[PDB]
Design a protein around this ligand. Structure first.
Ligand SMILES: Nc1ncnc2c1ncn2[C@@H]1O[C@H](CSCC[C@H](N)C(=O)O)[C@@H](O)[C@H]1O
Lengths: 385, 79, 408, 199
C-alpha cells in the first residue's frame, strides 16, 4: 500500500497517466484493492492530461471497490475541471460537497474562481470572490493570483494596478505568473509606459532568479544559441512541481508575449512547453482528424497555438481540421458557441483564412474545416515587435 | 367449495399430487403472512379459492362469510 | 350523477351448444363479411394461470383416428354401414380430409347429430375460402405455379374419390350424402379448413385424432395467439385457454395458432388464407450478399433463439426477414459498416427484382380488392395471397433501410 | 442528423471497426478520441468495438474498463456487447463476473437466456465443469429452460467425471422444464451408479 500510493502520487504529480493506469492494473491483477488515496493519484494524473472521461471512470470505480473519495479527491477533480473551464462540472462537485458534509475550504474557492475565469464567466468569478470574504476564510497567495487573472483577462488596467500593488504591500514578492499578467493587461491596452516600468523591476530582481531570467528573455536579450541555455535552465528547475504549476506558468508567459508583440518568441516558448509534456492534448495529427485543443489555454496562448497550427497546416490530407475550444458538457448547448474562447478562435480564424473554418451543427465547441475545403486554403505572420 | 374441489380435480391427472401441491402452497402462505391465518381465514381455503380464481371464475377469498344478523358482540348463533 | 351523464351472431348459435353443455366465458361470437369470430366481450384480466375461455363437450365433436385403424369418437357409424367401407378405402396418410368429409356428410344425414344443427353455421360453397372451391380463373390470380399445381392435384384427388365411391350403383343411404361432386368438394373444404388435430386421452386410450370441434373452429388463426386448445381427459371437454398472465381487452379477437412454423403457401393449401405477418415466410435470395445476423436482430430488438424469435415497425415480417435473409455470424466479430451497406444495397436490388416479377404492385392489389363487387371468395383470397407476399418483400426493403442506418 | 455528420460517422466507424476486427484495442481508443475531437458523440456501437477489441485479445480487465467508459458516457450497452463480455468471462473461468454481467442484462431489461446458455458452454469447454454446474443450476432453478443440446452436454460431462449428484440434479430440472429423460440420459447416470457397490 505504501509503495503503490507513493508511485501513483508521482504519476499524478507529473501527469504520467499511462504509468498510473499500469500500476492500477498491476494492483488489480494481484487481487489488491487500491486505497482511496491511490485512486486519487490516478484521478490527478488524468486531469493533468485533460482525460476527463478516464478520470471520472476512476472516480466511479472508487465507490465500486468501497474506497470512498476523501476531501483530496474532490480537489483533484476541481483543479482538473478548473483548468478546462468546466464550471458545469465544478458546480456538480460543489453541490455534492455541501451534501457530503464537507465545508468549503479555501482551495475549493480557488478552483471555483479559476473554473469560472477559464469558462468566460467573469461576473460569476468575482461574485465567488465577493461571497468568499463574507464567509470569512483566509485568501492565500494563489487566491490573489486567481482573482488577478480575472481582472487581467477582462482588460481592467486600474483594477489590476490596485490588486498588484497590494500583493507587494504585504511583502509577498509576487511570483512570475502575476508579473506576466501585468504585462498582458498593459500590453492589451498598448500602455507601453507601464510595460517598461515593470520590466525594469524584473531586470534587477536581486532576490528571485526566475524573474530576472524570464524578464530578460521577454525583451529578447537571451535569444542566442548559448544564451538560450540559461532560459532552459530555469524551465527545467520549474519542471519539478509537476504539470500543475507548469501549465499556469506557460499560460501567463505566452499571454504576456503575445500582447507585447513578441509573437515569434511565443512560438518558441510554446515549443519548449510541449517537449516537456505541457499541453499533451494540444495537437492530434492522424489520417482522420487534425485538431488543436485550446480549452485549457489563455487568449495569448490560444493565438500562439492557432498560429503555429495554421502554419503547419499549409505545409501539407485528413478528413477534418478542427479547433476544440469547449471540451465538456457545455458542448451540447448554445452557450458553448457563445463562449469567449469560441468567439475569439472563430474571430481569429475569420481574418486569417477568410471563411474556411465554420461552426459545427452537432457540437457547440468545435470549429471545423472539411477535407474538400482544406484544398481551397506562412498563413499567419510570426514576428517580434 | 365442494363443487370447486371437484372442478379442480377434473384438471388434475393424479389427486394425490393435487393434495401435496395444495399443502405446499398453503405452507408458503403461512410463512409469508403468519398472523392472517388460523381464524376466519384458513390457508387451505385461501389456496382453493385462489386456484378457482386463477381459472377466471370468481369466489370470495378463502370462502369466508359471516352472519349479518348477529345482535352485537358476545352473541353466538346456536345450532 | 348517473342521470346527468361485426354483428353479433345469431342468438341460437350459442344456444344450441349451450343447451348441450357448451360454455363460453367472457367471449362472444360475432359475424362479419369475412366470417365468424370469437371476441372478448369484456376485459379479461391476467391471472397466475391460463383462464378457461370455452368448454366444448366431446359428444358434440366429429373425430376420427389419425392413424389406422379408423375408429370414430364418439362412435356414430353403425356396424355394417357402407360409409365405413368408403372411409376404409382411403389412403391412410393423404386422405385424412376425405375420411372427415365422409363423416361430416354422414353426420348431416343423422337426425339426432349436433352437426345437423351446427352445419347451418358453416360457410357455404361460395363463402368458404378453401382453394378446393377455387375455379381455374381464381388460381390464375395466385401468381404461384407451385401452389396452383398443388391445388389442382387436391381438386383432382377429391373429385376422383367422389366419382369412384358415389357412382350409380351405390345404395340410397350413400347417394343422399353427396348427390353432386360440389357437395362432396364442399365437405372436404370444410374438413381441411376446420379440422383440429390433437393428441387426446379418452378413458385409458391415448391416440391422435382429427377432430371437427364446434365453436372452436370459429377461432381465427394468429401466429401470436392469445389462446390455446387443451384437452381435459377426465370429463372429455376441449378447453380454449387464454395465455397465462396475458391481459385481453374487450373486443379483442380470440385466436389460436392453426399451424406453427408453416408458411403462407401451406396456410393457403390447408385453410385458404394467408397473413402478411407470417414469421415463417421465406424469400429465395442468391446468398452472394449477406448481412450481420446479430446486428439485424439487435437493431429490431429480436431476441431468443432462431426457432423462437420474438419481438420485445417490427412485426412477424421482420422476424421472417431475419430467418430468410442471407446472414453471416462469427461469434463476436463486428461488421464493417461500409461492407454491410454494399450487402444491404445488393439485397434491396434483389428484392426489387422480385417485386418487378409481379405485373401489379401491393397497393394496386389492395385497391382492386376494394373495387370488387361480384368476386368469388377464393378470388379475393388469391389476390390477398399475392398482395401479402408483395407486402412481405416490401417490408424487407424497409427493414434493410432501417438496419443500414441504425448501424452507425 | 445532417448529411455531413452522417458522412463523418461512416468513415469514423469504418476505421474503428477495422481495428476492433484487427484485435487492436489501442487503435480503437485513438479513433474514439478522434470522434471527440471532431465533436461526434460515441454511441453504443462505438464502445462495442472497444469491448470486442479487448475481448478478442483475451483481456478481461480492459474489456471491463471499456464497459465502464460506456456506462460513464451515459450510453446503453448493446445486448451483443454484454454477450461478448459474458462469453469472455466464461473463457477465463470467471463465473462470478459472468453472473454479475447477467444480472446487468436483466437490469438493462435484456433477455439473459441466450447469454446464460453461452456462459455455461464456455465454462464446460474451458474445463471449469464445477463452475459450470453452479451457473447452470442457478439459471435452471431460476426458471430458464436450457437447450436440449446443453442438457445432454451437462448430464454426460458430469457422469464422465463421476459427479452423479450434479447429473441427477440437472436431469430432475430437465424434466421439470418439460424435457423428459431418454435412454441416453439414464445410461449416463447408470455409468456411475454401477460403481457404487450397491446393486
Ligand atoms: N387470420 C386469418 N386471416 C384471414 N382468414 C382467416 C384467418 N384465420 C382464419 N381464417 C379463415 O377462417 C377459416 C377457418 S374456420 C375459422 C372461422 C371462420 N372464419 C368461419 O366463419 O367459419 C379459414 O378457412 C380461413 O379462411
Amino acid at each position: 500500500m505504501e509503495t503503490y500510493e507513493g508511485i501513483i502520487f508521482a504519476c499524478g504529480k507529473g501527469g504520467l497517466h499511462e504509468d498510473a493506469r499500469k500500476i492500477l492494473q498491476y494492483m488489480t491483477a494481484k487481487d489488491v484493492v487500491p486505497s482511496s488515496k491511490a485512486y486519487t493519484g490516478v484521478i490527478e494524473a488524468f486531469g493533468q492530461a485533460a482525460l476527463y472521461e478516464e478520470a471520472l471512470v476512476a472516480f466511479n470505480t472508487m465507490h465500486e471497490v468501497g474506497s470512498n473519495p476523501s476531501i483530496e479527491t474532490f480537489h483533484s477533480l476541481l483543479y482538473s475541471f478548473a483548468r478546462g473551464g468546466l464550471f458545469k462540472e465544478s458546480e456538480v462537485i460543489l453541490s455534492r460537497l455541501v451534501n457530503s458534509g464537507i465545508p468549503r475550504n479555501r482551495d475549493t474557492f480557488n478552483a471555483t474562481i479559476e473554473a469560472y475565469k477559464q469558462g468566460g464567466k467573469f461576473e460569476e468569478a468575482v461574485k465567488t470572490y465577493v461571497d468568499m470574504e463574507k464567509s470569512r476564510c483566509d485568501p492565500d497567495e494563489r487566491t490573489l493570483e486567481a482573482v488577478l487573472s480575472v481582472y487581467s483577462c477582462a482588460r481592467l488596467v486600474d483594477e489590476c494596478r490596485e490588486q498588484f500593488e497590494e500583493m507587494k504591500a504585504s511583502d509577498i514578492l509576487p511570483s512570475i505568473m502575476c508579473y506576466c499578467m501585468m504585462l498582458s493587461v498593459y500590453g492589451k491596452t498598448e500602455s507601453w509606459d507601464d510595460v517598461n516600468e515593470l520590466l525594469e523591476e524584473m531586470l534587477s530582481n536581486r532576490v528571485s532568479n526566475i524573474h530576472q531570467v524570464i524578464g530578460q528573455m521577454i525583451k529578447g536579450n537571451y535569444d542566442d544559441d548559448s544564451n538560450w541555455q540559461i532560459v532552459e535552465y530555469v524551465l527545467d528547475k520549474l519542471n519539478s512541481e509537476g504539470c500543475g504549476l507548469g501549465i499556469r506558468f506557460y499560460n501567463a508567459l505566452l499571454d504576456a508575449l503575445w500582447w507585447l508583440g513578441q509573437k515569434e518568441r511565443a512560438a518558441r516558448v510554446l515549443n519548449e512547453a510541449t517537449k516537456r509534456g505541457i499541453f499533451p492534448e494540444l495537437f492530434r495529427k492522424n489520417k482522420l482528424v487534425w485538431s488543436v485543443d485550446v480549452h485549457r489555454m489563455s487568449e495569448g496562448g490560444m493565438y500562439t497555438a492557432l498560429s503555429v497550427w495554421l502554419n503547419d497546416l499549409s505545409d501539407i490530407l485528413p478528413q477534418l481540421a478542427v479547433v476544440v475550444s469547449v471540451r465538456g458538457q457545455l458542448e451540447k448547448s448554445s452557450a458553448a458557441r457563445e463562449s469567449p474562447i469560441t468567439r475569439a478562435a472563430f474571430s481569429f480564424l475569420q481574418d486569417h483564412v477568410s471563411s474556411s473554418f465554420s461552426f459545427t451543427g452537432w457540437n457547440g465547441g468545435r470549429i471545423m474545416c472539411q477535407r474538400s475545403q482544406l484544398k481551397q486554403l506562412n498563413i499567419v505572420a510570426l514576428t517580434n515587435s | 367449495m365442494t363443487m370447486d374441489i371437484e372442478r379442480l380435480l377434473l384438471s388434475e391427472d393424479n389427486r394425490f399430487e393435487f393434495v401435496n401441491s395444495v399443502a405446499a402452497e398453503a405452507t408458503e402462505y403461512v410463512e409469508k403472512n403468519r398472523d392472517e391465518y388460523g381464524g376466519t381465514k384458513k390457508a387451505i381455503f385461501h389456496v382453493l379459492s385462489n386456484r378457482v380464481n386463477d381459472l377466471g371464475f370468481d369466489r370470495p377469498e378463502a370462502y369466508a362469510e359471516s352472519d349479518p344478523y348477529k345482535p352485537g358482540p358476545g352473541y353466538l348463533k346456536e345450532y | 350523477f348517473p342521470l346527468f351523464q361485426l354483428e353479433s351472431a345469431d342468438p341460437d348459435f350459442y344456444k344450441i351448444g349451450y343447451v348441450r353443455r357448451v360454455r363460453a366465458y367472457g367471449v362472444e361470437f360475432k359475424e362479419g363479411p369475412d366470417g365468424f369470430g370469437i371476441y372478448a366481450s369484456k376485459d379479461i384480466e391476467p391471472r397466475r394461470r391460463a383462464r378457461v375461455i370455452m368448454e366444448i363437450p366431446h359428444e358434440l365433436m366429429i373425430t376420427i383416428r389419425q392413424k389406422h385403424p379408423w375408429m370414430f369418437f364418439p362412435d356414430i357409424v353403425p356396424i355394417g354401414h357402407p360409409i365405413f367401407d368408403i372411409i376404409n378405402s382411403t389412403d391412410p396418410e393423404r386422405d385424412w380430409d376425405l375420411r372427415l368429409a365422409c363423416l361430416l356428410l354422414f353426420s348431416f344425414d343423422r337426425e339426432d347429430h349436433f352437426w345437423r344443427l351446427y352445419g347451418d353455421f358453416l360457410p357455404a360453397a361460395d363463402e368458404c375460402s378453401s382453394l378446393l372451391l377455387a375455379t381455374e380463373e381464381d388460381l390464375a390470380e395466385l401468381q404461384d405455379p407451385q401452389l396452383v399445381s398443388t391445388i389442382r392435384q387436391q381438386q383432382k384427388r377429391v373429385l376422383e374419390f367422389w366419382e369412384k365411391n358415389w357412382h350409380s350403383g351405390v345404395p340410397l343411404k350413400i347417394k343422399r350424402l353427396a348427390e353432386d361432386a360440389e357437395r362432396f368438394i364442399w365437405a372436404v373444404s370444410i374438413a381441411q379448413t376446420r379440422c383440429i388435430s390433437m393428441k387426446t386421452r379418452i378413458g385409458a386410450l391415448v391416440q391422435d385424432l382429427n377432430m371437427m370441434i364446434p365453436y372452436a373452429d370459429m377461432l381465427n388463426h394468429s401466429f401470436e395467439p392469445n389462446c390455446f386448445l387443451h384437452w381435459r381427459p377426465k370429463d372429455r371437454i376441449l378447453e380454449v385457454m387464454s395465455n397465462a398472465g396475458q391481459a385481453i381487452k374487450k373486443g379483442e379477437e380470440m385466436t389460436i395458432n392453426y399451424m406453427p412454423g408453416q408458411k403462407n403457401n401451406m396456410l393457403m393449401e390447408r385453410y385458404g388464407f394467408s397473413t402478411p405477418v407470417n414469421p415463417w415466410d421465406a424469400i429465395p435470395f442468391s446468398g452472394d450478399s449477406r448481412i450481420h445476423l446479430n446486428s439485424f436482430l439487435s437493431v429490431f430488438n429480436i431476441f431468443g433463439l432462431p426457432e423462437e424469435y420474438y419481438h420485445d415497425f417490427v412485426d412477424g415480417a421482420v422476424i421472417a426477414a431475419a430467418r430468410t435473409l442471407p446472414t453471416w455470424s462469427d461469434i463476436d466479430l463486428p461488421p464493417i459498416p461500409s461492407a454491410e451497406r454494399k450487402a444491404v444495397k445488393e439485397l434491396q436490388d434483389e428484392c426489387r427484382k422480385m417485386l418487378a416479377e409481379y405485373p401489379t404492385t401491393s397497393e394496386q392489389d389492395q385497391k382492386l380488392l376494394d373495387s370488387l363487387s361480384e368476386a368469388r371468395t377464393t378470388f379475393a383470397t388469391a389476390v390477398k395471397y399475392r398482395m401479402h407476399r408483395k407486402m412481405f418483400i416490401g417490408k424487407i426493403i424497409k427493414a434493410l433501410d432501417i438496419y443500414q442506418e441504425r448501424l452507425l | 442528423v445532417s448529411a455531413l455528420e452522417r458522412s463523418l460517422r461512416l468513415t469514423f466507424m469504418d476505421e474503428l471497426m477495422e481495428r476492433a476486427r484487427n484485435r487492436d484495442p489501442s487503435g480503437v481508443s485513438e479513433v474514439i478520441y478522434d470522434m471527440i475531437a471532431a465533436g461526434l458523440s460515441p454511441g453504443p456501437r462505438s464502445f462495442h468495438g472497444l469491448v470486442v477489441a479487448h475481448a478478442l485479445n483475451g483481456d478481461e480487465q480492459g474489456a471491463m474498463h471499456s464497459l465502464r467508459k460506456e456506462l460513464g458516457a451515459g450510453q446503453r450497452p448493446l445486448p451483443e456487447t454484454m454477450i461478448a463480455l459474458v462469453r469472455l468471462s466464461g473463457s477465463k473461468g470467471n463465473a462470478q463476473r459472468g453472473l454479475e454481467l447477467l444480472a446487468a442484462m436483466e437490469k438493462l431489461n435484456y433477455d439473459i437466456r441466450q447469454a446464460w446458455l453461452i456462459l455455461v458452454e464456455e465454462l464446460v469447454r474451458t474445463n471449469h465443469l464445477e463452475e459450470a454446474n453452479k451457473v447452470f443450476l442457478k439459471g435452471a432453478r431460476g426458471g430458464m429452460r436450457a437447450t436440449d443440446q446443453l442438457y445432454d452436454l451437462m448430464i454426460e460431462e458430469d457422469c464422465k467425471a463421476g459427479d452423479h449428484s450434479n447429473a441427477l440434479d440437472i436431469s430432475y430440472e430437465m424434466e421439470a422444464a418439460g424435457r423428459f429423460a431418454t435412454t441416453f440420459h439414464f445410461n449416463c447416470l447408470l455409468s456411475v451408479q454401477a460403481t457404487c457397490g450397491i446393486p
